[PDB]
């Protein structure tokens, strides 16, 4: 049935927790608090700006979300500390299974794509950094449609770039809110649950719940 796979980037293939280290060495002890508030602010800004029809690229939203987090925690964030800390995302590390799981996936002749909210500038940066560029067929950014997920205009891009119907495209995501929208759109959905989280209560259920990409490779 499936001939392609649309992956999320942050949290699904690459660990966001990689930022904590660089956040802590700038604001000692506070490094874990700055990141937890950073990611929630990012997500909330992309969703709200979309609803307000006031779009700005992901790089902009990530910078604004940090500026708020630091100001909210009373932390003093100068210009330079803002750049290197935002530069941290462009160097995330993939979860241990990812590299080998992707390799065996492509070996089965399936089309692999990344449907991420990050700018095409960011997407290529983290993927190439991990040396995983030679593994994906398409690196899809939401920038063109000028709106963020879970807006359906985003999910279509994946259906158009892969040249396959949504029914032949497996949607893989760690974020249960994205897997809810994708399922509504029509994609068969696989939720990656490494931390034993519970699904969102927005009326949907993923077709598959797994603990790592290892299980995705075994679905074939």
């Amino acid at each position: 049935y499936i001939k392609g796979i649309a992956f999320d980037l942050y949290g699904t293939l690459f660990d966001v927790h990689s930022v904590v280290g660089r956040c802590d060495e700038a604001f000692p002890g506070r490094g874990r608090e700055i990141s937890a508030l950073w990611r929630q602010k990012q997500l909330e800004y992309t969703w709200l700006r979309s609803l307000m029809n006031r779009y700005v690229n992901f790089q902009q939203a990530t910078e604004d979300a940090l500026r708020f987090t630091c100001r909210h925690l009373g932390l003093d964030l100068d210009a330079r500390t803002r750049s290197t800390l935002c530069d941290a995302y462009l160097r995330l590390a993939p979860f241990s299974e990812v590299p080998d799981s992707l390799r065996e996936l492509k070996r089965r002749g399936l089309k692999l794509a990344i449907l991420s909210n990050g700018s095409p500038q960011s997407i290529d940066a983290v993927v190439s950094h991990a040396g995983l560029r030679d593994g994906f067929d398409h690196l899809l950014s939401v920038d063109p449609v000028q709106v963020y997920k879970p807006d359906n205009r985003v999910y279509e891009l994946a259906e158009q770039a892969l040249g396959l119907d949504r029914s032949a495209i497996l949607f893989v995501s760690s974020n249960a809110w994205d897997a809810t929208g994708a399922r509504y759109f029509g994609f068969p959905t696989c939720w990656i649950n490494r931390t034993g989280n519970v699904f969102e209560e927005m009326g949907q259920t993923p077709d598959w719940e797994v603990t790592s990409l290892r299980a995705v490779v075994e679905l074939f």
Copy 2:
């Protein structure tokens, strides 16, 4: 310039913290954790469901947000405990200044309205409960437009029900994310900052920042 005022309900005129008590007497010690996660889940569900174009009334979203919160904290939430705890919102208490501030406001002949996300069922319940029904001209729900804030289709309702241009309507809100959307829409905005929070980093700034409704009454 201003001839009318559009108020938010939860957090602006009525205290959400009123729920903590009834939450704690059902799950002792955990009462403050269940509420903090409840409100964030409510907001996130209204925003996401809007973007997914999958609307359900506020009463539904408040019930789903609790079902998740409890399941996320491992708490066992039976049928009855879900009803009385959700019934808690229909009995919130207004901040001390609210009752008198609203009275002196109407005395100045300004039109007062509530533009809330809650169902018209909820809005009238909490307002009448506090005996504040005789103080508002219109009780606007988002239910008709089938979408939640900060979507502009919501802000228009206020401009249409009051029969005034957005420039003659003061938008009062405690939630800085709502005051950002309203300002974009065109309303003069007053942010109620009682907890000394910092504004969102979504490109906007309210026209007025105050600590209570007392300052709003003095703007006239």
